[PDB]
Amino acid sequence: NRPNRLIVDEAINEDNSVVSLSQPKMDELQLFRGDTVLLKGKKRREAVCIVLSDDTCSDEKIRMNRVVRNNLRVRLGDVISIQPCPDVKYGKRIHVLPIDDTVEGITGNLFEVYLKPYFLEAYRPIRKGDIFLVRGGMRAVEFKVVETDPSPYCIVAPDTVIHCEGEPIKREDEEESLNEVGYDDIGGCRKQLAQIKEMVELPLRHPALFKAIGVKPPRGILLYGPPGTGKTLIARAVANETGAFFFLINGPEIMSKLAGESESNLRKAFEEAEKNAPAIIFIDELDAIAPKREKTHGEVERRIVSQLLTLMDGLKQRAHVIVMAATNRPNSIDPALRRFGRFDREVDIGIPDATGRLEILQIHTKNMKLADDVDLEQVANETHGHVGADLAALCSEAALQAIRKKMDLIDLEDETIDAEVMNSLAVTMDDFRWALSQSNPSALRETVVEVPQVTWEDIGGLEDVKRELQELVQYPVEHPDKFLKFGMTPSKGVLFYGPPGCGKTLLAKAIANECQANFISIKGPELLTMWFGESEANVREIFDKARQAAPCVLFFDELDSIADRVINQILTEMDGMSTKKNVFIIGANRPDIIDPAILRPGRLDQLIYIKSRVAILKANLRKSAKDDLTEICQRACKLAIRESIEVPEHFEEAMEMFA
Amino acid sequence: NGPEIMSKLAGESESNLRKAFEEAEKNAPAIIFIDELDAIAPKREKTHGEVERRIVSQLLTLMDGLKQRAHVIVMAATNRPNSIDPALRRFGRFDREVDIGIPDATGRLEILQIHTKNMKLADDVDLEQVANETHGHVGADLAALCSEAALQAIRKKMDLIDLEDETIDAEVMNSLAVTMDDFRWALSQSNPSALRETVVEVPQVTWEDIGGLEDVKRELQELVQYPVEHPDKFLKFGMTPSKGVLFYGPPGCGKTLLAKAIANECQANFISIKGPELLTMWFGESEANVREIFDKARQAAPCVLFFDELDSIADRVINQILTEMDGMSTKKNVFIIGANRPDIIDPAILRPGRLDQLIYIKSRVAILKANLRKSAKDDLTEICQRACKLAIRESIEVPEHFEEAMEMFA
Ligand SMILES: Nc1ncnc2c1ncn2[C@@H]1O[C@H](COP(=O)(O)OP(=O)(O)NP(=O)(O)O)[C@@H](O)[C@H]1O
Ligand SMILES: Nc1ncnc2c1ncn2[C@@H]1O[C@H](COP(=O)(O)OP(=O)(O)NP(=O)(O)O)[C@@H](O)[C@H]1O
Ligand SMILES: Nc1ncnc2c1ncn2[C@@H]1O[C@H](COP(=O)(O)OP(=O)(O)O)[C@@H](O)[C@H]1O
């Protein structure tokens, strides 16, 4: 019913002048490639840009970056009308202007700097009144098309004289900034972002629905993670994204107010968020305001939490507010905010994976002229355990470096601090090398969630167990119905005991690869020691970030390290682990100091043990002449590389009771 | 609302509680319900305040001030005996405990049913199923589920169909159905993580899941199957029934599946307090947590208690379980089972007034029949499982394997 209309979705191609559809739709709409389309959005707007194809598009959702989307006064979810519009004629005169707030500080001629680079061989269809963004000179510039000759919309051709006077246009009310915290600004946090998104989607963008309805719509949204994971952003952006009024509550701020005035604030906090509703009240650094754990010692520290819990209930479904809190971990927060009616929806944000950090890194360089030798992916690679902040700060450092070298030293000619300068000012792969080898690479590490990369290629011999695990996992994850035709239910865990350097680990990380499910490597030394004292509570937390990161396979290497608390605790959270969910559990030199209970059912009821020393030499020199296991292959790669520096091709020089 | 009553200026707090009763004593009969009390009156070791102390008082000053003629029944909701101040327990204040607990198999169903008495559930919505896989949830958990699952429907079908237009009206929601795929989504979320604890269920397993050793089988039925159905037949001899029994021996022997069974023949609940568990996964220094167990024990009667893996641990925990063992009103349905190391076992536990009954655990030929019942026609289970597998893995590759799988103390 009404084919020409489709639901706006985020864009894959960040290029302003393009909207991409799915092929079947485009044929249904007699649309080709270079095809120029017309777009009628909300508030009576029209945005004529170019349409393309896209395999991951929806047969009814038109992908489109925020520019083309704000130029329609549309949010993500609203549906627009597309219509082929090939009757556009090469402009003649394109009189434009910069929104006075993206230019405050840049001197010189904009045109030459941002305009020309922008249009040169693009022919970007443009329509009178469109606000488009240009990233150059190490920042962002918003330009408003004031008057276009082939009116309304024309195609900026090479012969279309593009005028630019000198009276930056004041930013009109409704024309929200494009420099605004957006979805496109958050990277690496895909799957979980996607979760915040649906929770609010309904109550936040479809208000009335919760009037003609009587259903419990989340109110409190808690975000977990370590400082710099990007909660604020993910927050300010989901609000800035769905047209909600965003009202912030900086936790340290709310404490730095006279003993009492504190309250009044939180109250106005909600008293103002309940005004412009839909609205998201974001409590930043909550663990500072409401940490009623064993740090709760105060005649006023207690009144505050109350006052907030008195409001974290006071809000009715009709209020149209979704309160979002950002704490660090289950224990930083008061166990009373967990009540069902307050902050009941946890969303774990975590450390960005290999790909993440890249996106992230990419996201913060969308302005600086990176060099041809800047392999951002590289930067992403050697940075193993960083968070957003760490990664962003890096781009600033690395960047400032450029500016600290080339430019001001060249002060000698003079101080032309202008556009053309920053514009051509490049940041080479040596600027990141400097930024990285600093006093900032020291990132606050913790337990990471990655997607196993190693397959069965890095494990030779013992192919006995290999064809076994694939049956307790490679079948209940891809073949769900084949496991309801027998009656029996899958195992919750398994155990791998034996001598060191045997293969257990490289196997546990492997088994997950064949299921594309994450992994969690909780080393033995580690829970007890390097984490937090008396942390039988830290253990339940592990499972939280475990069952949540599903599909996944858990693995506690070196279980012999430790019926005591820790063990018994890992055992308790082992039974309460919703079996009917993707939460596998591996185990790990001393089958004696091992509590038999761990051997017992409902836990590690599976018992395994670890030709071999002939093929484990092939998968140990693959990426490495043609004539403990690795303790030798390494003493060779060395005497082999030390023999060259002194022709890349050594060895002679290197040379059951329990079962 | 307890947090509410604390979030008021140091002092105004009182005035409230007073009007609280000053208004409830007006429209009386009336029930003054103190929500989240453990926040107001937790005079346990968290009682550190020149004002935290005045409040509790002020309330205890009223929790007495009320006369029979007042016509008010004050109801408090706390989490456990220790969350509350031991002074509210005085006879005259809050003296009547009513333990609400985690909903059993049937419960969760009703519950689930109760929150869908409005949404057009689909013909393929087996609510009982939802009830089944959700083992340890509470009301909230279960309700929140219906909302999630529900919103799901509304988040799919409807607004996507925004394309026609936004007719948010009755006929829409009316025909808007919530399928068994909406609950599948709601369940496989970040909410199924329910706050588990010790549950009270009605043993389902009978004597069918235990073959061999029918010696003890015809024994327990005499210390329970007779004093629960035949009360007078136990006052015609003089002797009084045993308060407990003990089952020691090698692993995977049958003790547990027996303790849960013995209760089934009496339709009496059961409580499985695993060994690792009291000490570890509960709360530290919890010789007080142990008396609590008996509280939720004698209360859930008729019932049979069972501490599996007693060898895990005269120390506190044990001695404590022993103390609350004598003070356990014998003239009430409070049986007590026990549970690989008859050495690290304090003889006192062997002694009378406790586990004066001592038992030990054909067999490995019939324990194979009750292990393949609901499962060809040509440690005990450590094999029957390696078979059901190589049997189902042999099909995915026709539902019918084995060859492939293959006293000092007494
Ligand atoms: N099957 C294998 N294939 C390739 N390399 C292996 C294999 N087994 C052991 N290694 C090498 O031996 C070292 C120990 O590897 P790993 O398998 O990760 O530990 P582990 O045997 O599981 N540890 P542990 O639990 O203490 O016995 C590594 O540096 C590997 O390169
Ligand atoms: N009599 C029995 N009938 C059927 N199955 C049994 C029997 N005894 C043991 N099993 C199996 O053995 C495993 C251990 O069962 P269970 O009887 O519950 O423990 P237990 O012997 O009481 N434990 P423990 O106190 O450590 O010796 C289970 O998976 C059962 O299926
Ligand atoms: N996942 C990410 N992708 C891109 N940028 C990120 C991400 N996480 C953090 N950042 C950047 O790091 C900084 C940290 O932001 P913020 O959300 O406020 O931190 P916090 O998690 O402490 O609240 C921001 O300026 C943001 O742009």
mmCIF file of C-alpha atoms in Angstrom, chain B residues 15-170:
data_model
loop_
_atom_site.group_PDB
_atom_site.id
_atom_site.type_symbol
_atom_site.label_atom_id
_atom_site.label_comp_id
_atom_site.label_asym_id
_atom_site.label_seq_id
_atom_site.Cartn_x
_atom_site.Cartn_y
_atom_site.Cartn_z
ATOM 1 C CA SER B 15 6.186 13.942 61.982
ATOM 2 C CA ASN B 16 5.359 11.806 58.949
ATOM 3 C CA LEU B 17 5.215 8.418 60.629
ATOM 4 C CA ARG B 18 3.029 10.107 63.204
ATOM 5 C CA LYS B 19 0.520 11.535 60.691
ATOM 6 C CA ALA B 20 0.920 8.134 59.046
ATOM 7 C CA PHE B 21 -0.785 6.578 62.048
ATOM 8 C CA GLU B 22 -2.748 9.759 62.737
ATOM 9 C CA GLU B 23 -4.578 9.295 59.458
ATOM 10 C CA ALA B 24 -4.797 5.523 59.503
ATOM 11 C CA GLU B 25 -6.418 5.733 62.883
ATOM 12 C CA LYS B 26 -9.001 7.949 61.226
ATOM 13 C CA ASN B 27 -10.654 5.828 58.528
ATOM 14 C CA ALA B 28 -10.064 2.627 60.625
ATOM 15 C CA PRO B 29 -10.331 -0.322 60.108
ATOM 16 C CA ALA B 30 -7.149 0.461 58.258
ATOM 17 C CA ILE B 31 -3.869 -1.139 57.188
ATOM 18 C CA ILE B 32 -0.703 0.855 57.466
ATOM 19 C CA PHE B 33 1.710 -0.712 55.110
ATOM 20 C CA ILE B 34 5.365 0.045 55.606
ATOM 21 C CA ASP B 35 7.151 -0.684 52.377
ATOM 22 C CA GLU B 36 10.932 -1.245 52.311
ATOM 23 C CA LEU B 37 11.119 -1.190 56.134
ATOM 24 C CA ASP B 38 14.640 -2.647 56.293
ATOM 25 C CA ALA B 39 15.536 0.889 55.069
ATOM 26 C CA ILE B 40 13.824 2.614 57.987
ATOM 27 C CA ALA B 41 14.278 0.099 60.775
ATOM 28 C CA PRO B 42 17.410 -2.006 60.259
ATOM 29 C CA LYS B 43 18.865 -1.518 63.808
ATOM 30 C CA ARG B 44 21.164 -4.484 63.059
ATOM 31 C CA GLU B 45 24.905 -3.717 62.724
ATOM 32 C CA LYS B 46 23.983 -0.932 60.203
ATOM 33 C CA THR B 47 22.511 1.174 63.007
ATOM 34 C CA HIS B 48 24.902 4.135 63.069
ATOM 35 C CA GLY B 49 23.025 7.409 63.396
ATOM 36 C CA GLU B 50 21.914 10.215 65.692
ATOM 37 C CA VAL B 51 18.855 10.360 63.449
ATOM 38 C CA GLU B 52 18.695 6.783 62.166
ATOM 39 C CA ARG B 53 18.113 5.854 65.779
ATOM 40 C CA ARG B 54 15.477 8.474 66.486
ATOM 41 C CA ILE B 55 13.378 7.262 63.546
ATOM 42 C CA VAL B 56 13.191 3.578 64.507
ATOM 43 C CA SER B 57 12.322 4.691 68.014
ATOM 44 C CA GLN B 58 9.582 7.031 66.790
ATOM 45 C CA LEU B 59 8.071 4.079 64.941
ATOM 46 C CA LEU B 60 8.467 1.611 67.790
ATOM 47 C CA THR B 61 6.855 4.311 69.914
ATOM 48 C CA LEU B 62 3.859 3.996 67.683
ATOM 49 C CA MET B 63 4.056 0.254 67.054
ATOM 50 C CA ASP B 64 3.034 0.062 70.695
ATOM 51 C CA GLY B 65 0.998 3.246 70.968
ATOM 52 C CA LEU B 66 -1.777 1.523 69.029
ATOM 53 C CA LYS B 67 -4.472 -0.050 71.187
ATOM 54 C CA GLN B 68 -6.709 -3.011 70.273
ATOM 55 C CA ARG B 69 -9.555 -0.471 69.879
ATOM 56 C CA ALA B 70 -7.480 1.449 67.312
ATOM 57 C CA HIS B 71 -8.457 -1.041 64.622
ATOM 58 C CA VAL B 72 -5.255 -0.929 62.649
ATOM 59 C CA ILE B 73 -3.181 -3.805 61.404
ATOM 60 C CA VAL B 74 0.289 -2.631 60.528
ATOM 61 C CA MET B 75 1.992 -4.569 57.760
ATOM 62 C CA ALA B 76 5.695 -4.466 57.075
ATOM 63 C CA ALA B 77 7.591 -5.848 54.170
ATOM 64 C CA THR B 78 11.219 -6.684 54.753
ATOM 65 C CA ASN B 79 13.497 -9.152 53.040
ATOM 66 C CA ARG B 80 14.771 -11.361 55.854
ATOM 67 C CA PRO B 81 14.997 -11.625 59.683
ATOM 68 C CA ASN B 82 18.344 -9.770 59.710
ATOM 69 C CA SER B 83 17.296 -6.833 57.477
ATOM 70 C CA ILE B 84 14.972 -5.808 60.324
ATOM 71 C CA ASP B 85 15.783 -4.551 63.760
ATOM 72 C CA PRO B 86 15.492 -7.331 66.351
ATOM 73 C CA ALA B 87 13.439 -4.867 68.435
ATOM 74 C CA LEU B 88 10.468 -4.843 66.055
ATOM 75 C CA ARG B 89 10.148 -8.550 66.912
ATOM 76 C CA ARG B 90 8.932 -7.720 70.406
ATOM 77 C CA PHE B 91 5.622 -9.213 71.280
ATOM 78 C CA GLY B 92 3.391 -6.172 70.832
ATOM 79 C CA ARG B 93 4.865 -4.804 67.607
ATOM 80 C CA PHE B 94 5.614 -7.023 64.554
ATOM 81 C CA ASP B 95 5.180 -10.524 65.976
ATOM 82 C CA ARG B 96 3.454 -12.356 63.154
ATOM 83 C CA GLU B 97 5.746 -13.578 60.368
ATOM 84 C CA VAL B 98 4.265 -14.721 57.036
ATOM 85 C CA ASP B 99 6.859 -16.037 54.651
ATOM 86 C CA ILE B 100 6.097 -15.229 50.981
ATOM 87 C CA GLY B 101 8.431 -17.153 48.730
ATOM 88 C CA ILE B 102 9.345 -17.971 45.178
ATOM 89 C CA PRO B 103 6.374 -19.271 43.150
ATOM 90 C CA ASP B 104 6.337 -23.000 42.427
ATOM 91 C CA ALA B 105 5.815 -24.613 39.024
ATOM 92 C CA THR B 106 2.060 -24.056 39.117
ATOM 93 C CA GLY B 107 2.378 -20.590 40.669
ATOM 94 C CA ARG B 108 4.463 -19.027 37.931
ATOM 95 C CA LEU B 109 1.767 -20.288 35.563
ATOM 96 C CA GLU B 110 -1.111 -18.622 37.381
ATOM 97 C CA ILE B 111 1.086 -15.573 37.718
ATOM 98 C CA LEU B 112 1.917 -15.619 34.051
ATOM 99 C CA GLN B 113 -1.769 -16.116 33.350
ATOM 100 C CA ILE B 114 -2.794 -13.280 35.577
ATOM 101 C CA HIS B 115 -0.774 -10.741 33.575
ATOM 102 C CA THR B 116 -2.095 -11.682 30.147
ATOM 103 C CA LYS B 117 -5.791 -11.394 30.935
ATOM 104 C CA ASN B 118 -5.851 -8.552 28.445
ATOM 105 C CA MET B 119 -3.515 -9.199 25.542
ATOM 106 C CA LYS B 120 -4.734 -11.343 22.649
ATOM 107 C CA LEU B 121 -2.429 -14.339 23.175
ATOM 108 C CA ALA B 122 -1.957 -16.576 20.146
ATOM 109 C CA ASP B 123 -3.214 -20.152 19.643
ATOM 110 C CA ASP B 124 0.413 -21.345 19.820
ATOM 111 C CA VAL B 125 1.101 -19.587 23.129
ATOM 112 C CA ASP B 126 1.683 -22.357 25.635
ATOM 113 C CA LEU B 127 1.874 -20.178 28.739
ATOM 114 C CA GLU B 128 2.502 -23.329 30.750
ATOM 115 C CA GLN B 129 5.705 -23.677 28.760
ATOM 116 C CA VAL B 130 6.813 -20.164 29.632
ATOM 117 C CA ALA B 131 6.094 -21.193 33.207
ATOM 118 C CA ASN B 132 8.249 -24.299 32.873
ATOM 119 C CA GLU B 133 11.624 -23.065 31.608
ATOM 120 C CA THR B 134 11.430 -20.135 34.050
ATOM 121 C CA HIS B 135 12.604 -22.033 37.116
ATOM 122 C CA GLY B 136 13.592 -19.417 39.627
ATOM 123 C CA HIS B 137 11.689 -16.194 38.905
ATOM 124 C CA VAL B 138 9.477 -14.145 41.149
ATOM 125 C CA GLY B 139 6.336 -12.188 40.418
ATOM 126 C CA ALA B 140 8.073 -9.123 39.020
ATOM 127 C CA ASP B 141 10.446 -11.167 36.830
ATOM 128 C CA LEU B 142 7.446 -13.028 35.462
ATOM 129 C CA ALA B 143 5.330 -9.894 34.975
ATOM 130 C CA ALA B 144 8.044 -7.793 33.453
ATOM 131 C CA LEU B 145 8.242 -10.682 31.025
ATOM 132 C CA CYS B 146 4.669 -10.292 29.866
ATOM 133 C CA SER B 147 5.237 -6.572 29.305
ATOM 134 C CA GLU B 148 8.472 -7.189 27.322
ATOM 135 C CA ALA B 149 6.992 -10.029 25.266
ATOM 136 C CA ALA B 150 3.917 -7.864 24.792
ATOM 137 C CA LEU B 151 5.674 -4.636 23.788
ATOM 138 C CA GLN B 152 7.544 -6.867 21.363
ATOM 139 C CA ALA B 153 4.347 -7.609 19.455
ATOM 140 C CA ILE B 154 3.489 -3.865 19.487
ATOM 141 C CA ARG B 155 7.027 -3.072 18.405
ATOM 142 C CA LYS B 156 6.776 -5.408 15.440
ATOM 143 C CA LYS B 157 3.742 -5.703 13.745
ATOM 144 C CA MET B 158 2.036 -2.427 14.516
ATOM 145 C CA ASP B 159 4.293 0.568 14.051
ATOM 146 C CA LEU B 160 6.204 -0.922 11.149
ATOM 147 C CA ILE B 161 2.696 -1.015 9.691
ATOM 148 C CA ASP B 162 2.915 2.714 10.346
ATOM 149 C CA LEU B 163 3.321 2.703 6.570
ATOM 150 C CA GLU B 164 -0.425 2.519 5.971
ATOM 151 C CA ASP B 165 -0.829 5.069 8.659
ATOM 152 C CA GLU B 166 -0.902 5.543 12.431
ATOM 153 C CA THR B 167 -4.307 4.208 13.403
ATOM 154 C CA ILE B 168 -3.637 3.823 17.120
ATOM 155 C CA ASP B 169 -7.126 2.659 18.063
ATOM 156 C CA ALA B 170 -8.991 -0.036 19.675
#
